[PDB]
């Protein structure tokens, strides 16, 4: 089930993908937007999000399974940060690009983010670095001075995140 | 949880025609209608595999759906010859029933033909078929398959038809 | 694990499939002759016996999972009851041929056979009937009158009791 | 639980020589000696995924092993590029080590024709060989590979050659 990889969400996902794993798992849903932006990432590691349905049912709960008709290529930053901005009851986008400063401030809050960790990042975003912001996130969660990666994909934010966790 | 296509040559070998059409229509067309669900789904539940219907995240011609197996260790019964035979005909968007019953003999004779099966058998097969002796038939089909003069029992079953297939197939 | 299939084992396994996963459950072991019987049994309903290893021990537990170099094809009745007699420390061969009928009186009692059936068993394990022993025996434990097909392999007597509980 | 089939792909678009090596030898011999079961195993580790040696039912010169891999989500770190380079040297039983530092030249050659790297890249390759330099050899490698002009990166871990191949795969 979907609450298999909670943890591993907070401890690697990148917070684009970390905002919509939990928006699925408080809302029980996603419009497309999110579910094409957090499936394929989810893709990118190797794993496929579906909705189990019951075969018995005529027609006229969301699953992660190991993956066994679509372009399944994920989403880099740029196509997250420069297309689709999300429209109220949209939880896709790029949160650096997308929250409103003062929210951002109160997500890496509850991610634990430290005072002086969150105004580097607040300094950048102001600048429009959002991906340096990113990696400035990367670095503070996984307790290094320089991720050592120049960071312009989700699914490498999480690469590089199960090298560290892994290491 | 495992992918349909794991159970493509079983299905060749052991899968009577009328699951054995459901199975190539679910893989080909990625989505079965009620009936074939039923028909289909409940057969694999005789066997001890439960049949999973998901709809894939991208889903907005494809329908979205992605299906998969896994062992079983609601109160549906899996269909009899008869139940298939003389109940819920299929309709022009359905794969489901008996072959031997509901294909055109033309078309039921192509079939057989993809499926290999000698000028021979076939030629019994479709004489038994026009005296409407569709399961013996099926039994006909079962040994053309197997290669034994005899099939040894009497077809009322498709699960049936699987047990005694997979109990030649072992030895 | 193994311990998956303990329900499944007491439900559709036929009697000498059933001592081999319990001996291999209590055993934590099985000589080859059970191995051979019990893994090629449980190959043939599409499942691989494996006993896990630590990759990272330098040579110089057993689990079940579904199926992904040798001959796979599993044994028959006539097969178990006709070759390879097992020793002691051995738990495979065909209980109804290879058992003392005394022992084998207190294995059908703790499968909870009614002494009725039991005295049926075996009359027929005395006449060398074990294969119309063992259907009896598939006919008591699914309370049905005819078992309706004519036994002479194990994997047979599992798909047949699959169609009956799934039924 | 997965076949390491799963991953044959994504071995050759993603993973350095060494790993490369390592997957081919163990999905043809069914096994790998130490020194390769720790530097795959733990680069497979590194990325997320935890690789299984199981001992199969039948084993009483096919050792009689079976290999699976699964999503992890003991205390031993994935090997860097110096550690694979300059200890634990491959013997003959071994198909660990770097390719580029480990294996003779005229090998090497054969190797890097069988994975179809023009012969100008083999070139390239072979002289930097010549002058120990094997890491960037192996950064020509990833270049060809990938079809860029600079890999863009200084490389010293076989697990940051698997993340920067997938962020170019990935676009
Ligand atoms: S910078 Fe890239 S990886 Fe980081 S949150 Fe934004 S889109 Fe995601
Ligand atoms: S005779 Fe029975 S088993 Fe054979 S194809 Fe028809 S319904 Fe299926
Ligand atoms: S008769 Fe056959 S299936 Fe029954 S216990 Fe003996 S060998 Fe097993
Ligand atoms: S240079 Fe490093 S990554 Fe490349 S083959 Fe050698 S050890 Fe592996």
């Given at each position: 089930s979907l609450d298999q990889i909670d943890l591993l969400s907070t401890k690697s996902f990148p917070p684009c993908m970390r905002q919509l794993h939990k928006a699925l798992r408080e809302n029980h849903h996603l419009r497309h937007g999110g579910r094409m932006q957090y499936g394929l990432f989810l893709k990118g590691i190797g794993l496929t999000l579906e909705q189990a349905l019951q075969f018995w049912k005529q027609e006229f709960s969301y699953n992660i399974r190991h993956s066994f008709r679509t372009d399944y290529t994920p989403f880099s930053c740029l196509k997250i940060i420069l297309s689709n901005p999300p429209s109220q009851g949209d939880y896709h986008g790029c949160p650096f690009r997308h929250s409103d400063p003062e929210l951002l401030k109160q997500k890496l809050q509850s991610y634990k983010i430290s005072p002086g960790g969150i105004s580097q990042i607040l300094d950048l975003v102001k600048g429009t670095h959002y991906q340096v912001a990113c990696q400035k996130y990367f670095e503070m969660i996984h307790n290094?001075?320089?991720?050592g990666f120049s960071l312009n994909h989700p699914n490498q934010f999480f690469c590089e995140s199960q090298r560290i966790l892994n290491g």
């Amino acid at each position: 089930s979907l609450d298999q990889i909670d943890l591993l969400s907070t401890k690697s996902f990148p917070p684009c993908m970390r905002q919509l794993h939990k928006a699925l798992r408080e809302n029980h849903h996603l419009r497309h937007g999110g579910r094409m932006q957090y499936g394929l990432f989810l893709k990118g590691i190797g794993l496929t999000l579906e909705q189990a349905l019951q075969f018995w049912k005529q027609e006229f709960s969301y699953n992660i399974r190991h993956s066994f008709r679509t372009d399944y290529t994920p989403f880099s930053c740029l196509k997250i940060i420069l297309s689709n901005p999300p429209s109220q009851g949209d939880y896709h986008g790029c949160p650096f690009r997308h929250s409103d400063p003062e929210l951002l401030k109160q997500k890496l809050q509850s991610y634990k983010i430290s005072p002086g960790g969150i105004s580097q990042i607040l300094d950048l975003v102001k600048g429009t670095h959002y991906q340096v912001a990113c990696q400035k996130y990367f670095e503070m969660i996984h307790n290094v001075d320089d991720c050592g990666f120049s960071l312009n994909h989700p699914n490498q934010f999480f690469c590089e995140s199960q090298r560290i966790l892994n290491g």
